[model samples]
Target: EVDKRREINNEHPLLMMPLYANGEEFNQGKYTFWGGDTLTGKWENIPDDLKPYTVIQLHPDDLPKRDGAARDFYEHMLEEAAKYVNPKTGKNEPIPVILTVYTAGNMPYHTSAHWLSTSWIDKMYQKYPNLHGIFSTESYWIWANDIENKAADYLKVSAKNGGYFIWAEQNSGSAIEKAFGKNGKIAFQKSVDKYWKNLIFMFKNTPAAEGNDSTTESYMKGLWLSNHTYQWGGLMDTWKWYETGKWKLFASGNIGKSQGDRQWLTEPESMLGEEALGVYLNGGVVYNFEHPAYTYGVNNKESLLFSEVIKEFFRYVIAHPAPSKEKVLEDTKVFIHGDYSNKGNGKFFVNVNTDREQTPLYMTGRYNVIPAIPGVLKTDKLKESVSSSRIQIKEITSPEFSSTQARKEYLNKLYPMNYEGDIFAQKLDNRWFVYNYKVNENVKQTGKLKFNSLEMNVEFEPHTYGIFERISNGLKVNLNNFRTNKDSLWSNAQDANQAKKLPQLTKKGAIKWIEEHYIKDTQFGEKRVTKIVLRGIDKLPTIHSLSGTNNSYDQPSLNFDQKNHMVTITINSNGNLEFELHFLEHT
Candidate 1:
């Protein structure tokens, strides 16, 4: 059984573990112990047969105190390496070791900037050739706040030395949960909530078709996706370490897997979304992705969404010709957007929003805007249509339509009504394809349209676009054709000042209904619904109870469309009606 388990580590995908051992067992599994010569601590009797894959975690305590020299601790680590013989070269050499940097909130660790600066890390690599890279064994949630500053230092030093850096054991959810849980020592619960709120709010404001903000799960996806894109983009553009830069590590397990901060159980979409975005940005790998579903039980939707993201990544992002690193453009401080080449295939625009509300975007060209979640816009031709005239697009936001149901119930109808959430528009090859971006309620945008010698003022819906194939003397709708003053046999209008009450008699009197109106476009099959706005009363008439010829009432189903202090009714059917009406005010 011992021989059966004595397999080479390279045969498996396991990395070197931070456990102490005699060097012979290193080939069987991932284990490494510090050298006995380092300081006042337990040491392993390191063996000569230790292979190429080896890592020794250098402790900060081993370093010299303020009174001692700089290279004292590093010299001892290398001296320990001097004892081991390389089987390949049959000589002693520098043994590779990983130094540690304290995480953001950790006291002695974070404050260890005294020894953890780039200068100190640079000194180790300069003197000791065996130094592999630096490692920070903390969750990204605690590390991200200081990554740009402290982490950047380590990366710079590694890049310069042709070495690497490891952001090990990173899990945002696990990190936050650990901070909040009973046994965990992190105590930034309120701070974590504030960070989460700020991240979601920032995401909701970004304009992207796939950007959703309907649920907390959606917000988490957006947050991680946005963050990963930024980090990966930097690796692609800044460091030029395209491959290994995105080869970062993450943590996973049953610990805090279902907590609010955790995504293992509740937010599979978020997890995949993060990975997909990273892949899209840098063609990166999703390393150490240990989903709880794989260990315990896999959920159908989770598995399906994960598969969907992978398939979509292949079809949309990878299907296109690969992006050249030399041609990447300047990065944006806000959301990510880029054209891969100086005059490459197409451009990409990502809206990092994850809230329920849709973001509005305006682009002054005609192109097909495709929506690919994890956000990729597919297109061809790199240029945008140049416009000469000043086109000002302004839509004053409305207060109505508080919910999706309210938006569905709105009166002003759009041609293609059924759509997915989020409004994103970007130009490509001559068509404007929009995602399911919702139109604002009761609001219309006014702007000027100028084509050659012809000029006109246009009132259009905000977040809606049109494709212009051929310019014509634009089509017009004649309002006179749909206008009419017609009387009905079943209903009649009476002077409201004189006859303010409901039907007074059975055979002699009749209730009055107002005139009807309708509007339509000139094209065939473009007829709009007929509508009637009834006036002549200070307040609405009440209906106590009613009875009707089923067919008649069913034909002209009516409801109040209250706007402009008037009742506009939509008529769908035509029939006679019998109903009780109370036209009296509170008096």
Candidate 2:
């Protein structure tokens, strides 16, 4: 089951590493193949062998001014680069590098200037088809505010876009010292190392350790490394451990105390530290751990790193020519279930629907379904289903998928309404009536129109016409009936001012008016009018309701084009029954 979920095409396991340059200080010289003057020159000089793995660092200032331009450049570069295969191996190997952009603004002057606009990054992915992914130095760590939520959103966007890499740059310099204080390095490093060790141990022995704590020993037996210590005592101790070889010390000695002062003094230490502690300590760990527990299981730094490493380690298993799908799937399953918290009621099933003919099946409830067919389907919607045999359904709960309604509700919760546009309405008459045109007495030539009498075809207009009715007492019109025009004028309005104040009547700011006000011989017709134009239709003020239902009461009724005119009237099921005169017309 686990194998089924993780086996997503032949893409390499995403690895995102946060990188930083000493910015203006480190970037000072002119062009060279190794290090250059022009940005393009530096890019051009990248070794052909390493280019395939080399990620480009785009200074915020150097990024394209607009998203459209950025997208164009990204696509053009990818296409141009695609033309050149590795000459050394004479093989088709295109570089899979992400553009790492800086987002931090407060730097020691050595760091690159942080980029303020993230929308441009979003646009790059949205507009370019070949762009793989994006990496940010400070944005992922600082601007996200809510680390877990930001990471999840990042991962979701990346996954949806076929880009699955996120690099979080840690704070540089002696900021660690500033945070922990003078003698805090030893304790801090120890604490951090302990945390990583426990995580790694948990990743390998969590399930067993859950019932038997002794299983932790299995993980503790592995090699460990620490990078910092507070005073010279702590620093010297780390140095001695590496010198004495007392422990299987991977990396020892402080990389540096300051941001721009970074120096890799120990080779073994750097590699092992990169291998063991690199993942869990970074922002990627926060995302991996915070992922919905069901899909990737509970958040744990070690487990997440393990999952990532396992994916990378086994990349060759699935990437080799004539790869064994079964082996790959089996390995992924074992890796996912290695943690105790991850053990739950879940089963993974591979659906091969596209390959075979099948009926449409709607999913509901709690099912983690992933597509194995590359470039086939990448959405999770009831309408977005594939052939039964071609898809994989990982049953994390009792039922793999939920009922149609349940699935919709879940999706709605997951993706809530974020109103993105201006308010709109439709008008069928010149008077700007808010109600549906079919229910208008003037249009339909109907009296006392029932709510069910209106046409069901739903149409929308941009802030033009609307219906208006007054409401009083507790009586409210049925929304369904109003929508269908089964009944109209449930409430009566005393006057135009009362109609204007109708929006305040409902607790939720939902209703337009009270139903009782629209009844015959009610306050709605209490006043008298003079001119025929004012009495007929010319004097009626245009009105609109937010509810879209044609119901007279329990919906807001506000003047349409209020800024344009002062015309007012009382509209009943009979259309314009009474009107008040405001005779001046200003263009």
Candidate 3:
């Protein structure tokens, strides 16, 4: 049957329709009491065994005035729907739910501000992860002039956050009047066009509108209108104006009656409909509805039918087969840690549950580090000389662990931060080396070569390690000397002083300074170290540098606790390499 329907009309597959319902009305019509059948029996008789995808549009007027009750009810509905697992695969599905709390239609100020009112919905999502998404139509009036930009911003934030969803549509009745003013035609057209453009951008740059203006001028161009519900006077007028000439336009049908010669409640095939309204005249009937009645009216049978049709449409649409789960997961890039705010010496890595059975792969990474003491030597160069032999290194496979501590212990030892002045060399060949890094229970130690001298570089990766310096009489004298000779010795002293007058330095400020000066500094620029030192101090005054390199003269012997994740390098008098100690990661 599905294949036949598809063959008959290629424009739409049977499943791509959205269904909507009023939760209050549905609950009011108790399954058992409505027509006196068993609850399950009544539900069974309505349509196919396949359950419909339900989206509840809560009218603001219908919501309770009490805060607690409203919050409870809102949460309860979403939680209940979220528990519905797809029967076929026993996997969690979106349940295809949306909550549209109409503020313009009901109590004033209570739901007037679109973003403000929808904040409750955001709270609901946090409280109930199962709830699919929330949308606001109130912006039609609240942000009338900038509705397009506002709505786009809202939707983008929602999508990026998690599974939140939103759709753009013109508001109903008086709100529309206010938005477009008394003469709404021009404004409405402009808004709709803006919406169409934004919708295309939302769908990853797929044009929603068709015709010459569209890059893809085909049936796919019409897909933008797919799986959406239009309400109030918007859809009907849009359909009619597109079909009829502007000059020929006459009075619209009565608000509650059929318009033109057609039934006011006709369901267009292009728009999707219920089983009862099946493929009318080979897809022509779907688009044939004129003077369509609104989807909501007191005790209106058309409303009920419309509800049923929409539900069936969405059920089929959402249930359609999708690409494999593996492909979907691979395509999604889950962010672990990217913020520069998480600075300092720490270990960070993402943990992924390899078990496919788990519904959502639990993943997390943390910044772990030990605090350093002031005036400590931070780097030690190990003078280890080994036979010069180039061996092809393929992969490094590390095992997985249940806890982050275990991973840290394993990784730290394997790739201990080269604090000891060690010159680690690797020959890059044409072949791609598969380096498998993992974490496991037992700490394994294996190395192909032996070394005599370990060469350590003093500089650490910025923002990864924190350096603390203890104030010594001589060191303080050097600092005083630099400060006193500031302008003559350092080019950046003036700018540093100016920056100090500003607010407290933030991580962003530090990063910007590093990018502009430190990273971009040339050889001559590097020679101008005095200025660079000032810039660094401008960011954090405790950071300083040693003058001259007497491999072991003032090198400070310090301790590094891997468990504590701390590195301390001390400098003695006469700058030279001293003793080096570290709490190393065990491999």
Candidate 4:
């Protein structure tokens, strides 16, 4: 079951790690029995394969109300979690435990019963080595109550113990429906807009480990830097609050129609570019909830358009390496997460703007600020602390791969590089990503851009956020019209004449056939392929050939395009595309 969930996206696997293990019935039902039944099951009964990633669950509501009883309850939970040595690793590593705590942030719901006992958490970490970290159900607390100081209090203790905190936001679709009513499509847009805004707030205020010592492990190791960086509960759920039929169109809307058709639904426009900035800046970066579509299991599976958008967002961030411990500058508005104090950390300058408007920051170092829009730039090193006045700019520094390697190997592998107008340019660990946040107005950046040890003049689109990297003492321009190129290709594929030429197949049947043929097993495991079928092929590449070797495990393979012909094949790469072009002449 866990592996099945993991298969959903190889790049960003679902966190289906069970809180506890049971024998057969597991003496525990699969409902709210998670936290309460922790002591009911035997640790030895847990399957060896599940031991490594699984954790023990604890909620303040499930624990004993009294202090002594609660202490005993926690002791048993921690000791049991510690005893479960992962046989896979042959080490004494304990299966970690997560404690769900409530403070003033999630107040007035009997949550204070545990909030008053918040100090106990520090000692629990000190005494019980197995008590992993913390998590919260109420995410609005970040903005509503600004719980960074309170959250950091507990997170600091957990950081010393090698634990993490996953801050969650629940019911985005439901929130939309409530605001604008069932028939309100505009409300869906409002909900999505606010959804990204709240997350951006959460990401910024989500607390970094305190102290100026960048050398310490606890410097930037707080909420934003955690592994499962951020969480959303109802991004793919309709739940009785709205219409529920086809999982894609009506899953998150009440109109029972395709609400994902909005312009903001695209990867760059989704405001995840801002979210990506958080992940990229923090040196880090799950949508796995049971939907009505999956209630019947994988046999009757349905897909979501927004789900794919988010999965690509994850891939965009994962391609970059996270910065190590960095010195954080203490500013009330900006709150720098990167190491600008001693210039000790990597060349990445992540200027996160908490304020709404554009703020000019005096940044030291030479950097050619990558444009939100694609195209080349002239590298002119920064003279002073680059007093750049730009808000919504998300740029990464010191990428691992060069522009040539990125274009050849990774660009347009899974999805086309459709991001054009971005807020600011950033080059993550791998490829360059461009993002544009605005829907109505276009944004332009024609300033003398400078950061780190490189500087350049940027001419960006009206509303765009982009990424760039420093290489060979200069920066390269990202492709400007991948979006335009993809639109033309997809348009030809959808022509009425082209549709009649191809063999008809149901969406379900087509997927099944692709799984059997294209996604079949390689030597290592099942091949992960994203296949795109185009019908009306006016013209194709003069030379038709697969890119790499036949072996799907190590190198990418297959993918063909011919002159005035259809292309049919796949490249065995995670999040890479497989093109199946059906020709008009053949029919």
Q: Give lDDT per model, in order.
A: 0.28, 0.24, 0.25, 0.30
Q: Candidate 2: count the clashes.
A: 59
Please report how far candidate 2 places residue 122 from its true position, in Å. Answer: 3.2
Q: Which ten residues in a row have the lowest lDDT in candidate 1?
A: 234-243
Worst 10 residues of 4 by lDDT: 373-382
lDDT of 3 by residue, 1-587 (tens): 01110110122222211222222443464111111122122222323433342223322223334444345444554554556555558876444344544334223445422333446655665665544444443332344444434444444434433533343233122222232233333443233333322221110011111111111111111122121111100111212222221111122222221122222112222122311111111121111111212222111122222332333333332333222212222221221111111211111222311111111011111111111111111101100112102111111122322244564564454333422221111111110001001111111111111111211223211001111121221111110000001111122223424322334224234323323432233111011111001111111123234443222133333444445333334333311111212222222
Q: Which tens-of-lDDT digit does each residue in 181-294 have in candidate 2?
A: 222223322333222211111111111101211111111111111111100000001122112221111122221212110111111111111122212111012111111111
Candidate 4 per-residue C-alpha lDDT over 233-265 given as tens digits, one digit per residue, 9 for 90 to 100: 112222211122112111131222222121112
Cα-lDDT of candidate 3: 0.25
Distance (Å) between predicted and true CA of 480, model 2? 74
Off by over 4 Å in 4: 1-75, 88-91, 103-116, 136-282, 285-320, 323-426, 433-587
Provide the global lDDT of candidate 1 against the true structure. Answer: 0.28
RMSD of each: 27.2, 31.1, 31.4, 17.4
TM-score for each of the candidates: 0.27, 0.27, 0.28, 0.37
Give the higher-TM-score candidate: 2 or 4: 4
Ranking by TM-score: 4, 3, 1, 2
Error of 1 at 421 (Å): 31
